[PDB]
């Protein structure tokens, strides 16, 4: 029922005026066809959707923001969800995020408390968890879904966690 | 009754002599029409207002101030509310705010106390909560509402929290 | 009775030889007219005053001093109250104030004690509270009141708190 | 009886070879005239003195010394009291004072102990309290009183506290 | 049954547009032939696989990331598994990793806690453990298996732990 | 009996080869004339001395030494007492003194212990107390007394405490 | 039986493209000849081996890695064992090692705990213990054994412990 | 009996090849003449000595050594005692001394323990106490006594304590 | 029996390609001649050896390694023992040693624990004790013994302890 | 019996190729002549020695080593004792010593523990105590004794303690 589609199974088109674009097509199988699930293999996969039924989208997005040159330590992530005339926007939000700068270093105290592994320290300290739930609605009649992630203040390096994805709930 | 209109559903017009402008039109539906609410999708939406009745506005504004070049660590935010001759000002106030500078960094002690996540540290330390309540009154006869946020001392980067908005109380 | 007139309802005329000037006119309504109060909306408003009666002024002035270029950490604020020939001075005083410099930064210890919010630290540490009470007397016959705030040693940035104002007591 | 005359009611004439000069005239009202007091409004006021009677002067002088360019952290204040041929000196003294330098900054420990407000820290740490009592005698026959405050080692910024003044005792 | 094939028994082809490539051929012995194991000697060895049976691959990958010139302290490792027209991708994933920079040094406290040996400190602090399990499926009909490890943000030095390898489960 | 003559009632003649010179004349009133005392007003006053009787001088000298340019932190003060041919020396001594340098600053710990006021810290830490007692003898027949204070190693700023003076004992 | 051959009894040929080479010839004495042992004198000695019997090699390698110029604090040691056409490789492995940099210094705490002698601190902290056991097999028919130790990332100084050697087990 | 002759009552002749010279003549009064004492006034005084009797000299020498330019923190003081052909040396010794350098400053801890007064800290920390006792013998037949104090390594500033002198014991 | 020959009784020939050379001749006295001992006076002495008997050498070598310019904090000492065609090597070994660098300084804690004397701290912390025992054998037929001490990585200053020497056991 | 001859009673001849030379002649008084002692006055004195009897010399040598320019913190002192053809060496030894450098400064902790006086800190921390006992033998037939102290690594400043000397035991 709750088909989770990871973002690595989307088509990625990086740009400079719109940030990162996650677009993917939609396949509409008819009723009584045993809805399949999206294989979590990081391969471009068409999203299975019931033929005529409204689907509600839950966006789970974990990412690491890292500064390129400007080294500003706070930024605003812009999320824009589109759908298949031209594409019409159905959702837009902004989320303040923390971005790694070259002047940031772990204190020895942070190693002792947050975990000896330094990946754990970034997971508990710098990971940006963004969850848009019960806000996006999409129907299978539309044949395209697009997600835009753009940094507002400065152009930066975004490291999207592999488990980030959109949950297509019943 | 208490229709909350988030600021991301307003039309944004950034400038250099007036700061950021949040203008939006007003729709006047007649009585007995089941007042709708503003969908929190970040899309430009006309504000629903009762046909002939005085509305009181409560401005909730959470934002992150961040210095561009001047790096001054304190600023004065200027809030100016207009309405639809030319637009007439109905409210004006100033609020001192704290702005992130490139010379500011978290101490290890702040990580331990305010929260391991560094977004929590900014939320509890640098977030500017500004609440103008029971001070602004607007009637549905006027067909425009405008909010101006301008920094006085220096031109800066303002990161408005997504939950910031104006509450149109009964 | 105790009509509080905030300074943002005054007319502001910034200069370079006299500092900031807060001038505003006076309206003299006759007796038995239900003395109104000044609306705290930050809009230029004539001060209501009883037709023939001596009023005593209490100046409440909270402000943030911040250094522009000189970066001197102490200054002398000069307060001069005038009234409506030319304007005649009726009160003058000086108050030492603390001014933010670019070499000043919060210690981690100050965050823990004075409050996690950094605006609280400035409120409890750098805010200059100046209260002139029972020293200024003005009658409604005069049709102008002017307040001058000037820094003596150096030209600086003054951030006047929005609640600063003059209380016109019975 | 103990008429306190604040120094801001004197005439101030700043110079470069003599420092700051506080000169003011004297009015001699006759006996049985209900000796008035000096209004603490910071306005130039003639000092009321009994017609024929010796008055003893108590000089209360609180000030903030602040270095201009030399940044020396200790200085010698020279106090010279004159009276109304030319003016004849009747008192002279020197008082070592502490002067703020641009290399001085508060430790976090001083904030916790001496008071969260940084004006309190300067009041308890850098304020120079100078009290000359029972040393100066002046009669109302002389029609002028002059006080000179000059820094000896270097030319500096003196911030005289508003409550500083001369007490004309019975 | 669970034949573990270390990555040092693969053929290594370092590049600049695709990172490090681990390609190796597959030998298909028939049934009833006493499946041999891969000798852990770091020598190029053909992978033994049952003639007609689906094998599931478990990728165990421990590595040390170290910055060359860019000195960025966080990176995204890209894993792409291919198989033997041209090679078709069957799996792709990204894993955030921590990379040693020349500005990083051990604190004395880390020596006391994580172990006196400094290799233990890197093992418990900087070693990137990446385990893809129950996600990759490969059949012996295909005669080639390829693994690509590429750093996304910057070109870096990857030190693959000798025990890293792919487990060919029953 | 013990007439204390403060040094500010002497005539001061600063030089460069002899340091600071404190010279003053002597008045010899006859017996049975009610020996007066020296008024502590900082005005040049002739020293009252009994007509024919040996007087013993006690030199009390408190001063603040402060470095001009050389910034050496220790110096040798040279005291030479003369009397009224040419003047004949009757006493000479040297006293090591501590001199303020521009590289000296108070620690926060010194504020807590020696006193919150920073003038108290200099009084208890840098004030040079020099007391020559029962060593100098002068008779009223001689009509001049001269005291020379000169720094030996370097030319410096001496801040003589106002209470410093010579006690003319019975 | 377990003849231990220290590496200092090998022939050393340092290079730049292959690192350090430890090559030595093999003498094949016949059966019933009282197998001698290798004298631990650091002199080039032929390895005694039984005439026709498979020998298993256990490599014990303790070394100190020290950075020359690059100062990177982690490296990958490459071990390649050859034997006597051209030489054929029979074993290859990689071992991450810790390398001394010029920015590394002992904390006083490490002296107290790991031992007062500073050679003990390096022995317990920086010594790289590498033991390849039960992985290398060599027969006496081959007349040459070669061991290559090469640093992968950077060219460094390797200080091989004198007790390092290869154990030729029964 | 134990006539103490302070060094300031000697004739001082500073040089560059021999350091500081303390020479003074000797007066030989006959027996039964009530041996006088040397007045401690810092004036050149002939040393009283019994006509025909061997005197033993005890040299008490307290001094402050301070570096001029070389800033070396240790020196060797050379003491040479002569007497009245040419002068013949009767005693010579060397004493290591500590010399103030411009890189030396008091720690806050030294203020708390050794005394709040900074002259006490130098008295207990940098004062060089040199006492040659029961080593020098001089007879009144010789009419001259000379003491040479010279620094060996470098030319420095010596601040001889006023109580330093030679004790002429019975 | 156990004749200890200190290394200072050897002939020292410092070089640049071989390090320090300790060569000395051998005298062969016949049996029944009361074997003398080597006088520990630091003078070149022929080593007494029994005419025809194998002697076993025990090398005791304590030294201080100190960096000249390279300042590397770890080195490898190379010991080569020769004997009297050309000289034939009979022993060779390498010993890792710790070398003083100009960036190394004692902590105050090391003074308290390892001993107040700073020579004790070097004795317990930086002294390299090297003891080769029961490994070197030399017969009196050979008329020369040579010991070479050379630093491998860098040319350094070796301070050989005076008690270092070779023990010629029975 | 145990005549102690301080080194300051020797003739000193400083050089550059041999260091400091302490040479002095020997006087041979016959038996039954009441052996005198060497007066500790720092004057060149012939050493008294019994006419025909072997004397054993005990060298007591305390000195302060201080770096001139090289600033190396460890050195090797070379002691060579000669006697009166040319002079023949009878003893030679080397002693590692600690030398003051311009980068060395006392910690506040060392003042508290080793003694408030800073000369005590050097006495307990930097003083080099060298005692050669029961190693040197000299007979009165030889008419000259010479002691050479030379620093090996670098030319330095040696401050020999005044109590250093040679004890001529019975």
Residue numbers in the entry:
A (entry chain H), B (entry chain G), C (entry chain F), D (entry chain E), E (entry chain I), F (entry chain D), ...: 49 to 132, 145 to 230
Quote the study's own text.
Lipid droplets (LDs) are universal lipid storage organelles with a core of neutral lipids, such as triacylglycerols, surrounded by a phospholipid monolayer. This unique architecture is generated during LD biogenesis at endoplasmic reticulum (ER) sites marked by Seipin, a conserved membrane protein mutated in lipodystrophy. Here structural, biochemical and molecular dynamics simulation approaches reveal the mechanism of LD formation by the yeast Seipin Sei1 and its membrane partner Ldb16. We show that Sei1 forms a homodecameric ring that scaffolds and positions Ldb16, with the latter emerging as the primary TAG binder via specific hydroxyl-containing residues, as proposed for human Seipin. Thus, we propose that LD assembly by the Sei1/Ldb16 complex, and likely other Seipins, requires sequential triacylglycerol-concentrating steps via distinct elements in the ER membrane and lumen.
Similarly, cells expressing Sei1∆LH, where a flexible linker replaced the LH, also failed to stabilize Ldb16. Moreover, Sei1∆LH and Sei1LL cells displayed aberrant LDs however, in comparison to sei1∆ mutant, the frequency of supersized LDs was reduced. Atomistic simulations reveal that in WT Sei1, TM1 and TM2 adopt a stable conformation and maintain a constant angle indicating that they move largely as a single unit. This coupling of Sei1 TM movement is impaired upon disruption of the methionine-aromatic interactions, in Sei1∆LH and Sei1LL. Besides their uncoordinated movement, TM segments in Sei1∆LH and Sei1LL appear to explore a higher membrane area. To further demonstrate that the effect of methionine-aromatic interactions was restricted to the positioning and dynamics of the TM segments we solved the structure of Sei1∆LH. FLAG-tagged Sei1∆LH was expressed and purified as above, and analyzed by cryo-EM. As predicted by MD, the luminal domains of Sei1 and Sei1∆LH were indistinguishable. However, in Sei1∆LH the TM domains could not be resolved, likely due their increased movement. Together, these data show that the LH has a central role in controlling the positioning and dynamics of Sei1 TM segments, both important for Ldb16 stability. Like WT Sei1, expression of Sei1∆LH triggered dramatic changes in LD morphology in sei1∆ldb16∆ cells.
